[PDB]
Coordinates of C-alpha atoms in Angstrom, one line a residue:
Chain G
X1 CA 48.3 39.7 114.9
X2 CA 47.9 41.9 117.9
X3 CA 49.2 45.2 116.5
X4 CA 46.6 45.7 113.7
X5 CA 43.8 44.6 116.1
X6 CA 44.8 46.9 118.9
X7 CA 45.1 50.2 117.0
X8 CA 42.6 49.5 114.2
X9 CA 39.3 47.8 115.0
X10 CA 38.4 45.4 112.3
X11 CA 35.0 45.6 110.6
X12 CA 33.3 43.3 108.1
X13 CA 31.3 45.0 105.3
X14 CA 28.8 43.1 103.2
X15 CA 29.9 43.4 99.5
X16 CA 26.5 45.1 98.8
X17 CA 27.9 48.4 100.0
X18 CA 30.6 50.8 98.8
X19 CA 31.4 51.8 102.4
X20 CA 29.5 53.0 105.5
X21 CA 28.0 56.2 106.8
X22 CA 27.8 57.9 110.2
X23 CA 25.0 60.4 111.1
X24 CA 25.9 62.5 114.1
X25 CA 23.9 64.7 116.4
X26 CA 25.5 68.0 117.8
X27 CA 23.6 70.2 120.2
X28 CA 24.6 73.8 120.0
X29 CA 24.4 77.1 122.0
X30 CA 24.6 80.5 120.4
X31 CA 22.7 83.8 119.9
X32 CA 21.6 85.9 116.9
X33 CA 19.7 85.1 113.7
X34 CA 16.9 85.0 116.2
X35 CA 14.4 82.2 116.3
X36 CA 13.7 79.8 113.4
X37 CA 10.1 80.7 112.7
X38 CA 10.7 83.7 110.5
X39 CA 14.4 83.6 111.5
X40 CA 17.1 86.1 110.7
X41 CA 17.4 89.9 111.0
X42 CA 20.4 89.3 113.2
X43 CA 22.2 86.8 110.8
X44 CA 24.1 83.6 111.4
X45 CA 27.3 83.4 113.4
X46 CA 29.5 80.6 114.8
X47 CA 27.9 77.9 116.9
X48 CA 29.4 76.9 120.2
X49 CA 29.4 73.3 121.5
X50 CA 27.9 73.0 125.0
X51 CA 30.7 70.5 125.9
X52 CA 33.1 73.4 125.3
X53 CA 31.5 75.0 128.3
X54 CA 32.6 72.1 130.5
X55 CA 36.1 73.3 130.0
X56 CA 35.7 77.0 129.1
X57 CA 34.0 79.7 131.3
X58 CA 33.2 82.6 129.0
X59 CA 31.0 81.3 126.1
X60 CA 28.1 80.6 128.5
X61 CA 28.3 83.9 130.3
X62 CA 25.7 86.6 129.6
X63 CA 23.9 89.6 131.0
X64 CA 20.7 90.8 129.4
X65 CA 19.0 93.1 131.9
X66 CA 21.5 95.3 133.8
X67 CA 20.6 99.0 133.6
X68 CA 23.8 100.7 132.6
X69 CA 23.5 104.5 132.0
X70 CA 24.0 105.4 128.3
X71 CA 25.2 108.7 127.1
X72 CA 22.7 110.3 124.7
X73 CA 24.2 113.1 122.9
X74 CA 21.5 115.5 123.9
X75 CA 20.8 116.6 127.5
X76 CA 21.8 113.3 129.0
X77 CA 25.3 114.6 129.8
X78 CA 23.7 116.4 132.7
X79 CA 23.5 113.3 134.9
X80 CA 27.1 112.4 134.1
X81 CA 30.3 114.2 135.1
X82 CA 32.2 116.3 132.5
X83 CA 34.3 114.0 130.3
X84 CA 37.4 116.1 131.1
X85 CA 37.9 114.1 134.4
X86 CA 37.2 110.5 133.1
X87 CA 36.6 109.4 129.5
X88 CA 33.6 107.2 128.7
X89 CA 33.9 103.5 129.1
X90 CA 32.8 101.2 126.4
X91 CA 31.0 98.0 127.5
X92 CA 29.2 95.1 125.8
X93 CA 25.5 94.4 126.6
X94 CA 23.7 91.9 124.4
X95 CA 24.3 93.1 120.9
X96 CA 24.5 96.8 121.8
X97 CA 27.7 98.8 121.8
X98 CA 27.5 102.1 123.6
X99 CA 29.1 104.4 126.2
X100 CA 28.7 104.8 129.9
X101 CA 30.2 106.9 132.7
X102 CA 29.9 107.7 136.4
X103 CA 26.8 109.6 137.5
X104 CA 27.3 112.9 139.3
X105 CA 26.5 113.4 143.0
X106 CA 23.4 115.6 143.4
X107 CA 22.6 117.3 146.7
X108 CA 19.4 119.4 146.4
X109 CA 18.6 119.6 142.7
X110 CA 17.1 117.2 140.1
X111 CA 16.7 113.5 140.7
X112 CA 17.5 111.0 138.0
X113 CA 14.8 109.1 136.0
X114 CA 16.4 105.7 135.7
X115 CA 13.9 104.2 133.3
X116 CA 14.2 107.3 131.1
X117 CA 18.0 107.0 131.5
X118 CA 18.5 103.3 131.0
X119 CA 17.4 103.1 127.3
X120 CA 19.9 101.1 125.3
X121 CA 19.9 100.9 121.5
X122 CA 18.0 97.5 121.6
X123 CA 15.1 99.1 123.5
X124 CA 14.8 102.0 121.1
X125 CA 13.9 99.5 118.4
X126 CA 11.1 98.2 120.6
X127 CA 9.4 101.6 121.1
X128 CA 10.8 103.2 124.2
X129 CA 9.2 103.2 127.7
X130 CA 7.2 100.1 128.7
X131 CA 4.7 100.6 131.6
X132 CA 5.4 97.2 133.2
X133 CA 9.1 97.9 133.5
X134 CA 10.1 97.8 137.2
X135 CA 13.3 97.8 139.3
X136 CA 14.5 94.7 141.1
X137 CA 14.7 94.2 144.8
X138 CA 18.5 94.9 144.5
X139 CA 20.2 98.2 143.8
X140 CA 23.8 98.3 145.0
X141 CA 26.8 100.6 144.5
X142 CA 29.2 99.3 141.9
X143 CA 32.1 101.8 142.3
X144 CA 32.9 105.0 144.0
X145 CA 35.2 107.4 142.1
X146 CA 37.2 109.6 144.4
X147 CA 39.8 112.2 143.7
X148 CA 43.0 112.2 145.8
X149 CA 45.2 115.3 145.5
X150 CA 48.7 115.8 147.0
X151 CA 50.3 119.1 146.2
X152 CA 48.3 119.8 143.1
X153 CA 48.4 116.4 141.2
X154 CA 45.0 114.8 140.8
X155 CA 44.8 111.0 140.6
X156 CA 41.5 109.0 140.3
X157 CA 40.8 105.8 142.1
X158 CA 38.1 103.3 141.2
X159 CA 37.3 101.5 144.4
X160 CA 35.5 98.1 144.1
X161 CA 32.8 98.7 146.7
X162 CA 30.5 95.9 145.6
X163 CA 29.9 92.7 147.7
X164 CA 30.0 95.0 150.8
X165 CA 27.3 94.3 153.4
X166 CA 26.5 98.0 154.1
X167 CA 26.2 98.8 150.3
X168 CA 22.7 97.3 149.8
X169 CA 19.5 99.4 149.4
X170 CA 17.1 98.5 152.2
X171 CA 13.3 98.6 152.3
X172 CA 11.7 101.1 154.7
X173 CA 8.4 102.5 155.9
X174 CA 7.1 106.1 155.5
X175 CA 6.3 108.0 152.3
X176 CA 5.2 105.0 150.2
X177 CA 5.1 101.3 150.3
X178 CA 7.6 100.9 147.4
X179 CA 10.5 102.8 148.9
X180 CA 14.1 101.6 149.1
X181 CA 16.7 103.3 151.3
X182 CA 20.5 103.2 151.2
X183 CA 22.3 104.0 154.5
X184 CA 26.0 103.5 153.7
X185 CA 28.0 104.4 156.8
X186 CA 31.4 102.8 157.1
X187 CA 35.1 103.2 156.7
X188 CA 36.9 102.2 153.4
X189 CA 40.6 101.5 153.3
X190 CA 43.3 101.9 150.6
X191 CA 46.0 99.3 150.9
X192 CA 49.8 99.6 150.2
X193 CA 49.1 97.9 146.8
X194 CA 46.1 100.2 146.1
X195 CA 45.7 100.1 142.3
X196 CA 44.7 103.2 140.3
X197 CA 42.3 103.3 137.4
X198 CA 44.5 100.6 135.7
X199 CA 47.6 99.0 137.1
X200 CA 50.4 100.6 139.1
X201 CA 50.8 101.1 142.9
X202 CA 50.0 104.9 142.7
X203 CA 52.6 107.6 143.1
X204 CA 51.1 109.9 145.8
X205 CA 51.0 107.3 148.6
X206 CA 54.1 105.4 147.7
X207 CA 56.1 106.9 150.5
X208 CA 53.3 105.8 152.8
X209 CA 53.2 102.4 151.1
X210 CA 56.9 101.4 151.3
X211 CA 56.9 102.2 155.1
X212 CA 54.1 99.6 155.3
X213 CA 51.1 101.7 156.0
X214 CA 47.5 101.6 154.7
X215 CA 45.1 104.6 154.9
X216 CA 41.4 104.3 155.8
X217 CA 38.7 106.8 154.8
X218 CA 35.5 107.1 156.8
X219 CA 32.5 107.6 154.5
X220 CA 28.8 108.1 155.1
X221 CA 26.8 108.0 151.9
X222 CA 23.0 108.3 151.9
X223 CA 20.5 108.0 149.1
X224 CA 16.9 107.2 148.2
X225 CA 15.4 105.6 145.1
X226 CA 11.9 104.6 144.0
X227 CA 11.1 101.2 142.4
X228 CA 8.0 102.5 140.7
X229 CA 9.0 105.3 138.4
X230 CA 12.8 105.2 138.7
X231 CA 13.1 108.5 140.4
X232 CA 15.7 109.0 143.2
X233 CA 18.7 110.9 144.5
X234 CA 21.9 110.3 146.3
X235 CA 24.4 112.6 148.0
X236 CA 27.7 112.3 149.9
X237 CA 27.7 113.5 153.5
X238 CA 31.2 112.7 155.0
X239 CA 34.5 112.0 153.2
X240 CA 37.9 112.4 154.8
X241 CA 41.0 110.6 155.8
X242 CA 40.9 109.7 159.5
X243 CA 43.1 106.8 160.5
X244 CA 46.4 105.3 159.4
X245 CA 47.1 101.7 160.4
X246 CA 50.6 100.2 161.0
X247 CA 51.8 96.7 160.0
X248 CA 49.2 95.7 162.7
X249 CA 45.7 96.8 163.4
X250 CA 46.9 99.3 166.0
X251 CA 46.2 103.0 165.4
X252 CA 49.1 105.2 164.4
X253 CA 48.9 108.9 165.4
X254 CA 48.8 111.3 162.5
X255 CA 51.1 113.7 164.4
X256 CA 54.2 111.5 164.3
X257 CA 57.0 113.0 162.1
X258 CA 57.0 110.5 159.3
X259 CA 53.2 110.3 158.7
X260 CA 52.6 114.0 159.4
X261 CA 55.3 115.0 156.9
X262 CA 54.0 112.4 154.4
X263 CA 50.2 113.3 154.8
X264 CA 50.7 117.0 154.3
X265 CA 48.6 118.5 151.5
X266 CA 46.3 115.5 151.1
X267 CA 42.7 116.2 150.2
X268 CA 40.1 113.6 149.2
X269 CA 37.0 114.5 147.2
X270 CA 34.4 112.3 145.5
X271 CA 33.0 113.0 142.0
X272 CA 31.0 109.9 141.0
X273 CA 29.4 106.6 141.7
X274 CA 27.8 103.6 139.9
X275 CA 24.8 101.4 140.5
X276 CA 23.9 97.8 139.5
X277 CA 20.2 97.8 138.6
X278 CA 18.1 94.9 137.5
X279 CA 14.8 95.0 135.8
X280 CA 12.4 92.2 136.8
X281 CA 10.8 92.1 133.4
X282 CA 7.3 90.8 134.2
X283 CA 5.9 91.0 130.6
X284 CA 9.3 89.6 129.4
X285 CA 11.3 90.9 126.5
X286 CA 14.7 89.2 126.8
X287 CA 16.5 86.8 124.5
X288 CA 19.1 84.4 125.4
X289 CA 21.0 81.2 124.4
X290 CA 19.3 79.9 121.3
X291 CA 19.6 76.2 121.7
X292 CA 19.8 74.4 118.3
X293 CA 21.3 71.3 116.8
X294 CA 22.7 70.4 113.4
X295 CA 23.3 67.1 111.6
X296 CA 26.6 66.5 109.8
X297 CA 27.5 64.4 106.7
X298 CA 30.5 62.2 106.0
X299 CA 31.1 59.2 103.7
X300 CA 33.5 56.3 103.7
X301 CA 34.6 54.3 100.6
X302 CA 36.6 51.1 99.9
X303 CA 39.3 50.9 97.1
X304 CA 40.8 48.1 95.1
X305 CA 44.4 46.8 95.6
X306 CA 46.6 45.1 93.0
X307 CA 46.5 41.3 93.2
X308 CA 48.8 38.3 93.7
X309 CA 49.3 35.7 90.9
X310 CA 50.5 32.1 90.5
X311 CA 52.0 30.6 87.3
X312 CA 52.5 26.9 86.6
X313 CA 52.3 24.6 83.5
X314 CA 48.7 23.4 83.1
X315 CA 49.2 19.7 82.4
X316 CA 49.9 18.5 85.9
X317 CA 49.7 19.8 89.4
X318 CA 53.0 20.5 91.3
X319 CA 53.6 21.1 95.0
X320 CA 57.3 21.6 94.5
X321 CA 57.8 24.8 92.6
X322 CA 54.3 26.1 93.5
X323 CA 53.3 25.2 97.0
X324 CA 49.7 24.9 98.1
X325 CA 47.4 27.9 98.6
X326 CA 48.8 28.4 102.1
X327 CA 51.8 30.3 100.8
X328 CA 49.7 32.8 98.8
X329 CA 47.4 33.2 101.8
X330 CA 50.5 34.0 103.9
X331 CA 51.7 36.6 101.5
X332 CA 48.3 38.2 101.4
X333 CA 48.0 38.1 105.2
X334 CA 51.4 39.7 105.9
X335 CA 51.0 42.3 103.2
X336 CA 47.6 43.5 104.4
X337 CA 48.0 43.1 108.1
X338 CA 51.4 44.4 109.1
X339 CA 53.1 46.7 106.6
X340 CA 50.0 48.7 105.8
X341 CA 49.1 49.2 109.5
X342 CA 52.6 50.5 110.2
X343 CA 52.4 52.8 107.2
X344 CA 49.0 54.3 108.2
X345 CA 50.2 54.8 111.8
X346 CA 53.4 56.6 110.8
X347 CA 51.6 58.7 108.1
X348 CA 48.9 59.7 110.7
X349 CA 51.7 60.7 113.1
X350 CA 53.4 62.8 110.5
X351 CA 50.2 64.5 109.4
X352 CA 49.2 65.2 113.0
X353 CA 52.6 66.7 113.5
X354 CA 52.4 69.0 110.5
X355 CA 48.8 70.1 111.1
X356 CA 48.8 70.7 114.9
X357 CA 52.3 71.5 116.0
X358 CA 53.8 70.3 119.3
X359 CA 52.3 70.7 122.8
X360 CA 49.5 73.0 121.8
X361 CA 45.8 72.1 122.0
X362 CA 43.1 73.4 119.7
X363 CA 39.6 74.5 120.4
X364 CA 36.7 72.1 119.6
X365 CA 36.0 72.2 115.9
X366 CA 39.0 74.2 114.8
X367 CA 40.8 71.6 112.7
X368 CA 38.8 70.7 109.6
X369 CA 41.6 69.0 107.7
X370 CA 42.1 66.1 110.0
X371 CA 40.4 62.8 109.2
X372 CA 37.6 61.4 111.4
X373 CA 34.2 62.2 112.9
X374 CA 36.1 61.8 116.2
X375 CA 37.0 65.5 116.6
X376 CA 33.4 66.3 117.5
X377 CA 33.9 65.1 121.0
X378 CA 37.4 66.2 122.2
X379 CA 40.0 68.8 121.5
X380 CA 42.7 67.9 119.1
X381 CA 46.1 67.4 120.7
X382 CA 49.6 66.3 119.7
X383 CA 52.8 65.8 121.7
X384 CA 56.4 64.5 121.3
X385 CA 59.2 63.9 123.7
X386 CA 62.7 62.4 123.8
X387 CA 64.5 60.5 126.7
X388 CA 68.3 60.3 126.8
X389 CA 68.7 57.5 129.2
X390 CA 72.5 58.0 129.7
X391 CA 72.2 61.7 130.5
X392 CA 69.2 61.7 132.8
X393 CA 69.4 58.5 134.9
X394 CA 70.2 58.4 138.6
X395 CA 71.8 55.3 140.1
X396 CA 73.2 54.6 143.6
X397 CA 74.5 51.1 143.1
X398 CA 75.1 49.0 139.9
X399 CA 72.8 46.3 141.2
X400 CA 69.6 48.4 140.7
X401 CA 70.2 49.8 137.2
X402 CA 67.4 47.8 135.6
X403 CA 64.9 49.0 138.2
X404 CA 66.2 52.6 137.8
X405 CA 65.7 52.6 134.1
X406 CA 62.2 51.0 134.4
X407 CA 61.2 53.7 137.0
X408 CA 62.4 56.5 134.8
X409 CA 60.6 55.4 131.7
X410 CA 57.4 54.6 133.4
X411 CA 57.4 57.9 135.2
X412 CA 57.9 59.8 132.0
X413 CA 55.2 57.9 130.1
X414 CA 52.8 58.1 133.0
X415 CA 53.2 61.9 133.3
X416 CA 52.7 62.3 129.6
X417 CA 49.4 60.4 130.0
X418 CA 48.3 62.6 132.8
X419 CA 49.0 65.9 131.0
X420 CA 47.2 64.5 127.9
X421 CA 44.2 63.6 130.0
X422 CA 44.1 67.1 131.5
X423 CA 44.4 69.0 128.2
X424 CA 42.1 66.9 126.0
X425 CA 39.2 66.5 128.4
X426 CA 38.8 62.9 127.3
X427 CA 37.1 61.5 130.4
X428 CA 34.2 64.1 130.2
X429 CA 33.8 62.9 126.6
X430 CA 33.5 59.3 127.8
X431 CA 30.9 60.4 130.4
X432 CA 28.9 62.2 127.8
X433 CA 29.0 59.5 125.2
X434 CA 27.9 56.7 127.5
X435 CA 25.3 57.4 130.1
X436 CA 25.3 55.5 133.4
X437 CA 28.4 53.5 132.5
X438 CA 31.6 55.3 133.2
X439 CA 34.6 53.7 131.5
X440 CA 38.2 54.4 132.4
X441 CA 40.8 55.2 129.8
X442 CA 42.7 52.4 128.1
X443 CA 46.1 53.2 126.7
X444 CA 47.5 51.8 123.5
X445 CA 51.1 50.8 123.8
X446 CA 52.9 50.2 120.4
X447 CA 56.6 49.3 120.7
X448 CA 59.2 47.1 119.2
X449 CA 60.8 43.9 120.6
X450 CA 63.7 45.4 122.6
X451 CA 61.8 47.6 125.1
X452 CA 58.9 45.5 126.6
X453 CA 61.0 43.8 129.3
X454 CA 61.9 47.3 130.5
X455 CA 58.3 48.3 130.6
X456 CA 56.7 45.1 132.1
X457 CA 56.5 45.0 135.9
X458 CA 59.5 43.8 137.8
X459 CA 59.9 46.7 140.2
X460 CA 57.7 49.8 140.5
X461 CA 54.0 49.9 141.4
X462 CA 52.5 50.5 137.9
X463 CA 52.9 49.9 134.2
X464 CA 51.3 53.0 132.8
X465 CA 49.9 54.2 136.1
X466 CA 47.1 53.7 138.6
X467 CA 43.7 54.2 137.0
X468 CA 44.6 52.9 133.6
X469 CA 44.3 49.6 131.7
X470 CA 47.1 48.8 129.4
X471 CA 47.9 46.4 126.6
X472 CA 51.5 46.0 125.3
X473 CA 52.0 45.4 121.6
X474 CA 55.3 44.1 120.2
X475 CA 56.1 43.7 116.5
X476 CA 59.2 42.7 114.6
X477 CA 59.2 45.7 112.3
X478 CA 62.3 47.8 111.9
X479 CA 60.7 51.2 111.6
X480 CA 59.2 50.9 115.1
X481 CA 62.8 50.9 116.5
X482 CA 63.5 53.2 119.4
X483 CA 59.8 54.4 119.3
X484 CA 56.8 53.9 121.5
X485 CA 53.4 55.1 120.4
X486 CA 50.6 55.9 122.9
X487 CA 46.9 56.3 122.1
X488 CA 43.6 55.9 123.8
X489 CA 41.3 53.2 122.6
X490 CA 38.0 51.5 123.5
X491 CA 38.0 47.7 123.9
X492 CA 34.3 47.0 124.7
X493 CA 33.0 48.6 121.5
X494 CA 32.4 46.8 118.2
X495 CA 31.0 49.6 115.9
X496 CA 32.2 52.7 114.1
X497 CA 32.1 55.5 116.7
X498 CA 33.9 58.8 117.0
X499 CA 35.7 58.2 120.2
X500 CA 37.3 55.2 118.5
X501 CA 40.9 55.6 117.3
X502 CA 40.6 53.7 114.0
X503 CA 38.6 51.2 112.0
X504 CA 39.7 48.5 109.6
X505 CA 37.1 48.4 106.8
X506 CA 37.3 44.8 105.6
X507 CA 35.3 42.9 102.9
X508 CA 36.0 39.2 102.3
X509 CA 37.1 38.2 98.8
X510 CA 38.1 35.0 97.1
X511 CA 40.0 33.7 94.2
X512 CA 39.6 32.6 90.5
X513 CA 41.1 29.5 88.8
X514 CA 41.2 29.1 85.0
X515 CA 43.4 28.6 82.0
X516 CA 44.7 31.8 80.3
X517 CA 46.2 32.1 76.8
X518 CA 49.1 34.6 76.8
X519 CA 51.2 34.5 73.7
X520 CA 50.4 30.9 72.8
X521 CA 51.3 29.3 76.1
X522 CA 49.0 27.6 78.6
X523 CA 49.2 27.8 82.4
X524 CA 46.6 27.9 85.1
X525 CA 46.7 31.0 87.3
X526 CA 45.5 31.8 90.8
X527 CA 44.6 35.4 91.5
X528 CA 43.7 37.1 94.8
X529 CA 42.5 40.7 94.8
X530 CA 42.1 42.1 98.3
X531 CA 39.7 45.0 99.2
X532 CA 40.1 47.1 102.4
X533 CA 41.2 50.4 103.8
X534 CA 42.2 51.8 107.2
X535 CA 40.5 54.9 108.7
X536 CA 41.3 56.8 111.9
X537 CA 38.9 59.0 113.8
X538 CA 40.2 60.0 117.2
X539 CA 42.7 62.9 116.9
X540 CA 44.9 62.1 119.9
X541 CA 48.1 60.0 120.0
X542 CA 51.3 60.2 122.0
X543 CA 54.8 59.1 120.8
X544 CA 57.9 58.9 122.9
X545 CA 61.3 58.6 121.4
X546 CA 63.9 56.4 123.3
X547 CA 67.6 56.7 122.4
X548 CA 71.0 55.6 123.8
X549 CA 69.8 52.7 125.9
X550 CA 73.0 50.9 125.0
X551 CA 75.5 53.4 126.4
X552 CA 73.7 53.9 129.7
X553 CA 73.7 50.2 130.5
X554 CA 77.2 49.8 129.2
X555 CA 78.8 52.8 130.9
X556 CA 78.4 53.6 134.5
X557 CA 76.5 56.8 135.5
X558 CA 75.0 57.8 138.8
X559 CA 74.0 61.0 140.7
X560 CA 76.2 64.0 139.7
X561 CA 76.3 66.7 142.3
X562 CA 74.8 70.1 141.7
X563 CA 77.3 71.8 144.0
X564 CA 76.4 74.9 145.9
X565 CA 78.7 77.7 146.0
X566 CA 80.6 79.2 148.8
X567 CA 83.5 80.1 146.6
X568 CA 85.2 83.3 145.3
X569 CA 83.1 85.8 143.5
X570 CA 79.7 84.4 144.6
Chain F
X1 CA 4.7 89.9 114.3
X2 CA 6.9 86.8 114.4
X3 CA 5.1 84.0 116.2
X4 CA 6.8 81.3 118.2
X5 CA 7.1 79.5 121.5
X6 CA 9.3 80.7 124.4
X7 CA 10.9 78.9 127.4
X8 CA 12.3 81.0 130.3
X9 CA 14.4 80.6 133.4
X10 CA 15.3 83.7 135.4
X11 CA 17.5 82.4 138.3
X12 CA 17.7 83.8 141.8
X13 CA 21.0 83.0 143.5
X14 CA 24.1 84.6 144.9
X15 CA 27.4 83.7 146.5
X16 CA 28.3 85.2 149.9
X17 CA 31.6 84.9 151.9
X18 CA 31.8 84.6 155.7
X19 CA 35.2 83.2 156.8
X20 CA 38.2 85.5 156.2
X21 CA 40.8 82.7 156.3
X22 CA 42.1 81.1 153.1
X23 CA 45.5 80.0 151.7
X24 CA 46.6 79.4 148.1
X25 CA 49.8 77.7 146.7
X26 CA 51.1 78.1 143.2
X27 CA 52.9 74.9 141.9
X28 CA 55.2 75.3 138.9
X29 CA 57.8 73.4 136.9
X30 CA 56.4 69.9 137.7
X31 CA 57.1 68.5 134.3
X32 CA 60.6 69.9 134.0
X33 CA 61.2 68.4 137.4
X34 CA 60.0 64.9 136.4
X35 CA 61.8 65.2 133.0
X36 CA 65.3 66.3 134.1
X37 CA 67.5 64.8 136.8
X38 CA 68.4 66.7 139.9
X39 CA 71.3 65.7 142.2
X40 CA 72.1 67.4 145.5
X41 CA 73.1 70.8 146.6
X42 CA 76.4 70.3 148.3
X43 CA 78.1 73.2 150.1
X44 CA 81.8 73.1 149.3
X45 CA 83.6 74.3 152.4
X46 CA 86.9 76.0 151.7
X47 CA 89.5 73.5 152.7
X48 CA 90.7 74.7 149.3
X49 CA 91.9 78.1 150.5
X50 CA 89.2 80.8 150.4
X51 CA 88.8 81.4 154.1

């Protein structure tokens, strides 16, 4: 029968085993618990699958060298502004948690010893300053913290100045041969959506903003810094509002009534800055993604099922009351092959429903209750939908109703297939599992005997869509009424395998024939005890519920105007 | 005083932007649109007295 074969791949097990086993390999990315040789001292945490990075973009992101100033509680506060202007900002670097701020502009006084300054708690464990530590070819401004005051209210603005061409330290002659120079001379502009420290469209330039005007500040910042010891200085030279642009790039005089009244009392003053500094660690000290792999265990078993029996007087053979063995074989075949497959499919549907919920994916390895080694390769996913054919069908003439219904159903099922393909990342799993050969998804179609004429091609240009291979399965069962069950399968495979939907663990068994004495009567008996069990691995299946096909065909419905309103009160 | 082997890659790369012309479109409600039927926006014009 097609249905059991399509959803559950049959497998023969030699009776010398109690089941079969699957040993799986899982490559992992993570950090901590450092090394394996004398491991530990940072302890074990959650592994992350590398395939998760093919769909997520944060687990694989790291920074391990950036020199972010850290507030020591001693004299270190000198190089940072007073915390009464801007509180410290907590950032994550490696395993360290600490505090940073914006350095203070210095004109004629002390420089700043970056290497002395850039000591994070990880480095203090190692024994402070290392002679080979050196600064990279790049030092660039991260942010410029300016103060804009209008009438007495002070508001701070963090301007993203990075990625700017003029904001790169440049090599220069004179003094030494390891000197880098910053000559930052340009005009920075604040738009009409200029965000403050966090959110909002400000409140001192709002009158300027609504009119449709952006301000531009001309700034010349110069600084010098040495890539041998980490000494250097930087000071601001020019900072003032000069130009105000219109809705075009055409200069607007600051003497016109609106802007002149609006710009009265504005003063702009800088207080801080930030640098991105990299340390080309030549003797190397860094630690990164510790690449490891683990092996997982899972076992399969095979049960016993109650038998079928024959009774007949043991003095002569009869084909009348007891037919030949064919009848017993037929009873066994139907029992094992149709009812149990339907039961397993429906129970799997119900359990997936209860466990996962509707329309929400789950991260890889986050559902340990589901059955199957299959969840090692894709996200779990479940979905459900209903189609009310009478309520959501569009017709134009009665002669095209069959084609209309076919188009509607195929469009809905096809779209469900696309969204499942997007969310589960199945195709990437196929590409990873099989190298060089790239198979295309094959959809399982389980449906009863009333629908398939409305799914098979008579109009339209697809059955399940372009790019898919489909197999239609029809059964006479009553529970599969008004139901279609979608699932992804593999038709070229013949072994247990996690991308597989399900496997039919099958062992052949035979009969026994003898005479039995049961309360002083004699009759030969034929006994058949079957041995098998169904297992499912792949945790993805789609089911669409179809209702009210009778009324739509029976009763005319077409179109139904969403009128548009030029009437009283609207 | 822990002894092991190390493998290192310290990449050198960067992304730069030249052309200041780029457009984006947000697409929304596709699946509601394919799931529910939509039929016409007809402008009733007031031969029923309203003007």
